[PDB]
């Protein structure tokens, strides 16, 4: 612990060309474990993690049928939102749904989440209480009123608090040999000269999970300003990478230290350029 399971369902309309594209991607923490793709020759939910491959034909048949029902559900939703916004039948639009549940170190139910987007923007979201809804616009108010009558929050709450948590614990057991690992960052400071200044670049490689913090310090104080930083990128082997650079005066490299924060580290790392 702590661990979470997240599903990402997306449907994109393609008027004229054919039917909308429907994709599902499932994650246990930062590891993808399932995928569904309507554009595949024989569309079915498939494993994306070799520890998921153990799951039998009854599991895959059940998840394929669930995926195919959602695909049709979002095909109707796309046509419904077209009437809410009074949009034309010739345009491409997207619906995104992301939902999940977080478990603790125990692991018992911590947090649950469920929300939608239309054309890249918030549409409707389930509140932290898993009981009430937050509509983002006047169209989302129509959906909220309909779902309040149908008791949609109660149906989803049961899943998020119970069904979601028991399946995440099963996948955590199936994939324990790798899912329960914390690969600590492999760090090094590179030096690059320039107006008589030097670029110091603190690297963090081979870490898992993705959540990391890289900071530069000068005499106990963090250099928030004039600090370049890249987005955490996947190495493609299950680990992540990140770097943070600073521009310091030539020959003063020993005064700057890079501080690394990762759950895989008992204490934060401290490193500098090594001549």
């Amino acid at each position: 612990g702590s661990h979470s399971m997240r599903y990402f369902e997306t449907s994109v309309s393609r008027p004229g060309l054919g039917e909308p594209r429907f994709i599902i991607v499932g994650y246990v923490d930062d590891t993808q474990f399932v995928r569904f793709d309507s554009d595949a020759e024989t569309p079915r939910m498939e494993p994306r993690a070799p520890w998921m491959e153990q799951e039998g034909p009854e599991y895959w048949e059940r998840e394929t049928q669930r995926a195919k029902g959602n695909e049709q559900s979002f095909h109707v939703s796309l046509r419904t939102l077209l009437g809410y916004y009074n949009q034309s039948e010739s345009g491409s639009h997207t619906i995104q749904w992301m939902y999940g549940c977080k478990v603790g170190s125990d692991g018992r139910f911590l947090r649950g989440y469920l929300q939608y987007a239309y054309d890249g923007r918030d549409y409707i979201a389930l509140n932290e209480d898993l009981k009430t809804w937050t509509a983002a616009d006047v169209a989302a108010i129509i959906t909220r009123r309909k779902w309040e009558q149908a008791g949609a929050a109660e149906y989803y709450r049961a899943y998020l608090e119970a069904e979601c948590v028991e399946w995440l614990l099963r996948y955590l057991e199936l994939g324990k040999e790798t899912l329960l690992r914390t690969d600590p960052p492999k760090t090094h400071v590179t030096h690059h000269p320039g107006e008589g200044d030097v670029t110091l670049r603190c690297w963090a490689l081979g870490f898992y999970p993705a959540d990391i913090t890289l900071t530069w310090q000068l005499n106990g104080e963090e250099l928030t300003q004039d600090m370049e930083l890249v987005e955490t990128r996947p190495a493609g082997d299950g680990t992540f990478q990140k770097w943070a650079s600073v521009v310091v005066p030539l020959g003063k490299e020993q005064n700057y230290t890079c501080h690394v924060y990762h759950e895989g580290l008992p204490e934060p790392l401290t490193l500098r350029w090594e001549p």
């Binding site: 793709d37 997207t94 054309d119 890249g120 690059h192």
Partner: protein, 99 residues
């Protein structure tokens, strides 16, 4: 509501000349999801290029990883070329072994 793809081109492992590696092209922060990614060696398209399944961020923007096998040399040029609706011309990002 269009968002331009942001690109990072980088090796899986610290690069060494004449040691085979994997070249990544990490494309993020785009909308709509439809995208075309090319990987190039010395100006010509790389035939075998693996793509990950597209997911999206908490900010709803999509992301995807394209990867191919490569053998870095001092002289060879590596790039990632991305075509997306939000751009009138493809965006190309060249591989820089220090980033």
């Amino acid at each position: 509501i269009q968002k331009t793809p942001q690109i990072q081109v980088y090796s899986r492992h610290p690069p060494e000349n004449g040691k085979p590696n994997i070249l990544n092209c990490y494309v993020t922060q785009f909308h709509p999801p439809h995208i075309e990614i090319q990987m190039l060696k010395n100006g010509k398209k790389i035939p075998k290029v693996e793509m990950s399944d597209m997911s999206f961020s908490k900010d709803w923007s999509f992301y995807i990883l394209a990867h191919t096998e490569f053998t870095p040399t001092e002289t060879d040029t590596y790039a990632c070329r991305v075509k997306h609706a939000s751009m009138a011309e493809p965006k190309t990002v060249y591989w820089d072994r220090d980033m």
